[PDB]
Amino acid sequence: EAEVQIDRLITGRLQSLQTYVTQQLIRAAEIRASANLAATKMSECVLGQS
Amino acid sequence: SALGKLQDVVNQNAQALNTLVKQLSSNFGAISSVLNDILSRLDPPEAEVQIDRLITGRLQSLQTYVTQQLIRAAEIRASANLAATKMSECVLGQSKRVDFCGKGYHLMSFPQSAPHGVVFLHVTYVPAQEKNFTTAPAICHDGKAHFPREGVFVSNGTHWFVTQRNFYEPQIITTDNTFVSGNCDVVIGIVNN
Amino acid sequence: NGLTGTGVLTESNKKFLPFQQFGRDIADTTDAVRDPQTLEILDITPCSFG
Amino acid sequence: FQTRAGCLIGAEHVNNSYECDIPIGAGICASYQTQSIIAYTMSLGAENSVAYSNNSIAIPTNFTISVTTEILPVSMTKTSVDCTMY
Amino acid sequence: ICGDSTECSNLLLQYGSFCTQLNRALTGIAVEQDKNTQEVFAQVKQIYKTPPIKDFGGFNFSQILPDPSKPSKRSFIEDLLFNKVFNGLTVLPPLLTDEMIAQYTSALLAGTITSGWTFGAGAALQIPFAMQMAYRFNGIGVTQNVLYENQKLIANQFNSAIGKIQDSL
Numbered sequence: 001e002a003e004v005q006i007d008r009l010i011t012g013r014l015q016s017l018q019t020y021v022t023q024q025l026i027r028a029a030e031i032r033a034s035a036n037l038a039a040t041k042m043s044e045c046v047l048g049q050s
Numbered sequence: 051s052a053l054g055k056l057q058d059v060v061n062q063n064a065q066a067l068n069t070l071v072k073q074l075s076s077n078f079g080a081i082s083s084v085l086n087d088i089l090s091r092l093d094p095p096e097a098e099v100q101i102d103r104l105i106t107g108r109l110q111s112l113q114t115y116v117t118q119q120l121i122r123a124a125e126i127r128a129s130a131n132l133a134a135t136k137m138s139e140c141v142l143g144q145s146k147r148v149d150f151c152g153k154g155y156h157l158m159s160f161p162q163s164a165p166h167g168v169v170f171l172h173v174t175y176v177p178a179q180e181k182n183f184t185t186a187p188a189i190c191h192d193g194k195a196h197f198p199r200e201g202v203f204v205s206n207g208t209h210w211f212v213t214q215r216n217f218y219e220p221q222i223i224t225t226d227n228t229f230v231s232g233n234c235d236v237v238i239g240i241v242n243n
Numbered sequence: 244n245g246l247t248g249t250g251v252l253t254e255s256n257k258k259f260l261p262f263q264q265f266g267r268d269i270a271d272t273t274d275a276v277r278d279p280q281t282l283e284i285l286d287i288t289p290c291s292f293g
Numbered sequence: 294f295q296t297r298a299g300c301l302i303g304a305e306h307v308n309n310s311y312e313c314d315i316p317i318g319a320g321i322c323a324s325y326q327t328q329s330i331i332a333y334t335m336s337l338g339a340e341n342s343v344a345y346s347n348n349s350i351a352i353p354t355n356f357t358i359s360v361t362t363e364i365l366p367v368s369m370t371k372t373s374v375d376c377t378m379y
Numbered sequence: 380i381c382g383d384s385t386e387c388s389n390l391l392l393q394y395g396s397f398c399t400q401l402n403r404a405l406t407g408i409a410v411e412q413d414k415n416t417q418e419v420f421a422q423v424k425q426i427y428k429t430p431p432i433k434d435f436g437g438f439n440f441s442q443i444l445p446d447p448s449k450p451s452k453r454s455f456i457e458d459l460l461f462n463k464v465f466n467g468l469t470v471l472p473p474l475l476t477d478e479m480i481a482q483y484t485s486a487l488l489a490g491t492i493t494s495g496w497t498f499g500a501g502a503a504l505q506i507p508f509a510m511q512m513a514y515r516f517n518g519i520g521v522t523q524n525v526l527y528e529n530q531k532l533i534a535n536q537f538n539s540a541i542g543k544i545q546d547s548l
């Protein structure tokens with residue numbers, strides 16, 4: 001009888017962990033573009049005159 | 051006779067398709083992993099309860115695969131937009147953006163095709179073998195301040211010349227490579243010549 | 244008393260209220276306890292992992 | 294050896310600083326030298342004071358032509374899955 | 380999911396490899412966080428140092444140059460910025476410390492105060508700071524005598540405007 005009750009917890013916790021991991025991919029793809037802009041500004045405004 | 055940024059895409063995609071294939075052998079809490087062995091030794095009312103767990107697990111597998119492909123295609127699109135912009139600005143023109151087309155002063159670029167990408171060959175100019183000199187902002191002559199038209203005033207120790215700023219090529223200071231503005235009593239560092 | 248867990252117990256510098264029997268932090272994990280015979284409160288620290 | 298990334302066993306802690314080879318973390322890297330495995334604080338680069346003064350200038354007398362490569366992914370493999378047959 | 384209990388851990392095996400995928404994803408995003416910093420800050424080959432006697436034509440960079448008596452050898456304005464902002468879960472440290480990144484920015488800042496834009500194209504070539512300012516005025520279409528005849532005013536405006544960043548932060 002405890003198998004049926006443990007599976008209900010396993011399914012929920014897996015869902016929650018995988019939601020966490022999707023939203024981190026989507027947030028990291030946005031931090032990546034900001035850092036790519038910062039790297040271009042360091043080249044074009046600090047080591048040059050734009 | 052290097053290309054790891056292209057091998058990374060190939061490897062990540064094969065590594066995702068392999069996981070999708072291999073999840074077809076989990077039970078997800080059923081009696082068998084193969085559907086025919088549930089169909090062969092069970093009758094519809096109890097085949098159904100076991101088939102539903104397989105459906106639930108395989109649907110979730112497929113959805114994870116598709117979401118992670120959508121996130122990776124958006125990263126490939128940013129790369130391809132950057133490569134389009136480099137093709138326009140580095141191969142079809144000469145750029146002034148620092149570091150956009152290689153390290154140094156961009157002269158030209160040539161494209162080459164790769165298996166799922168592109169290789170740019172950037173030709174740049176890099177200055178070399180610098181020497182030391184003495185400088186001055188302006189020259190004073192006849193109570194007038196003289197500025198270079200395009201260059202710098204440099205001294206080899208005893209004589210003053212004008213040179214262009216990126217290549218040493220000294221010339222005499224005349225009224226054709228300078229212009230006048232004001233007296234020689236306002237600018238900090240005038241020298242007499 | 245029914246509070247069940249695992250970890251390493253040390254002595255603490257907290258001060259409960261006479262009726263309070265155990266403490267918990269943000270995220271609601273138990274991080275202290277009172278033992279029902281000494282009337283002393285003890286810190287609970289998870290057992291090292293990595 | 295105790296780092297800030299954790300406890301490290303089987304590597305000698307040298308005192309010199311090289312370029313980073315395998316990143317351990319919190320400023321520490323490891324490398325196979327000579328014959329053994331060593332762990333060190335990475336170096337950022339060689340130091341350089343510029344001979345700055347208020348009437349000195351450096352002007353180049355020669356140049357080099359440089360050619361360098363840059364590699365970019367454009368595309369990936371087009372795949373389809375029939376959801377029903379899977 | 381299970382928290383060190385063999386009953387839950389055996390049931391979990393029936394779900395395949397979901398938990399190797401999740402770890403692969405998190406590792407892939409923890410490596411690119413260090414790649415992000417490396418490409419913004421390691422834009423120098425040498426670590427340039429500024430001269431001991433600092434006469435830059437009236438311009439005063441003392442609130443943005445490193446301070447030895449401070450924590451981590453940060454500048455005065457880098458300090459105002461660092462003051463203003465369990466169960467299977469861990470936090471990994473970044474590869475570059477904060478000391479290393481402050482070192483990188485002080486090398487960029489000593490390269491530009493002292494060589495202009497030459498160090499980002501090759502070897503750093505020194506030039507006096509007001510002559511560099513005159514080149515930059517040429518780059519926006521003003522002539523050089525306009526800088527050299529207004530040097531003290533331009534330097535006072537710059538110093539007074541760097542002094543206001545410090546207040547506003």
Ligand SMILES: *[C@@H]1O[C@H](CO)[C@@H](O[C@@H]2O[C@H](CO)[C@@H](O)[C@H](O)[C@H]2NC(C)=O)[C@H](O)[C@H]1NC(C)=O
Nearest residue numbers: 179180181182183342343344345349350351352
């Ligand atoms: C321009 O002159 C300066 C100052 O004279 C030279 O700076 C020297 O740098 C070395 C570093 O290896 C120091 O050891 C010397 O003390 C410095 N002064 C000298 C040699 O007088 C600088 O090298 C010169 N630049 C060029 C291109 O020759």
Ligand SMILES: *[C@@H]1O[C@H](CO)[C@@H](O[C@@H]2O[C@H](CO)[C@@H](O)[C@H](O)[C@H]2NC(C)=O)[C@H](O)[C@H]1NC(C)=O
Nearest residue numbers: 183204205206207208209210211219220221222
């Ligand atoms: C600085 O340059 C000037 C001109 O290039 C040098 O003066 C000439 O030097 C040559 C040496 O063979 C003499 O023959 C000329 O008569 C000089 N005067 C001229 C051309 O008007 C000067 O020697 C250089 N100074 C240093 C310190 O190298």
Ligand SMILES: *[C@@H]1O[C@H](CO)[C@@H](O[C@@H]2O[C@H](CO)[C@@H](O)[C@H](O)[C@H]2NC(C)=O)[C@H](O)[C@H]1NC(C)=O
Nearest residue numbers: 185186187237238239240346347348349432434
């Ligand atoms: C550039 O710096 C030099 C040396 O730091 C200055 O030379 C000093 O000038 C003042 C007044 O002109 C004298 O009292 C000092 O004795 C000089 N120093 C030495 C070592 O002789 C120079 O004035 C500065 N400004 C320039 C060249 O425009």
Ligand SMILES: *[C@@H]1O[C@H](CO)[C@@H](O[C@@H]2O[C@H](CO)[C@@H](O)[C@H](O)[C@H]2NC(C)=O)[C@H](O)[C@H]1NC(C)=O
Nearest residue numbers: 189190191192193194234235239240241242243
């Ligand atoms: C450059 O030459 C001018 C003259 O052409 C010098 O100006 C003289 O300066 C002295 C001292 O300041 C004054 O007493 C004279 O009245 C000035 N004469 C003129 C005609 O202006 C100037 O001192 C010289 N400077 C250098 C550095 O050589």
Ligand SMILES: *[C@@H]1O[C@H](CO)[C@@H](O[C@@H]2O[C@H](CO)[C@@H](O)[C@H](O)[C@H]2NC(C)=O)[C@H](O)[C@H]1NC(C)=O
Nearest residue numbers: 244261262263264277278279280281282283284
């Ligand atoms: C529980 O009972 C024990 C004795 O069975 C008590 O222990 C005594 O505690 C006092 C401190 O208040 C000590 O001075 C004595 O030496 C202890 N005696 C023994 C035999 O251990 C304890 O205080 C009791 N606690 C409660 C809450 O009832």
Ligand SMILES: *[C@@H]1O[C@H](CO)[C@@H](O[C@@H]2O[C@H](CO)[C@@H](O)[C@H](O)[C@H]2NC(C)=O)[C@H](O)[C@H]1NC(C)=O
Nearest residue numbers: 433434435437438439440441442455538542545
């Ligand atoms: C550059 O500006 C700073 C101001 O931020 C000057 O340093 C301060 O000046 C005041 C006024 O004399 C002193 O009370 C402080 O003790 C100075 N040091 C600080 C605040 O750290 C500095 O003198 C200026 N540089 C030059 C060359 O004038």
Ligand SMILES: *[C@@H]1O[C@H](CO)[C@@H](O)[C@H](O)[C@H]1NC(C)=O
Nearest residue numbers: 294305306307308309310332
């Ligand atoms: C490294 O250098 C420090 C200098 O402060 C010294 O104390 C330490 O013993 C050195 N370690 C080794 C292994 O040489």
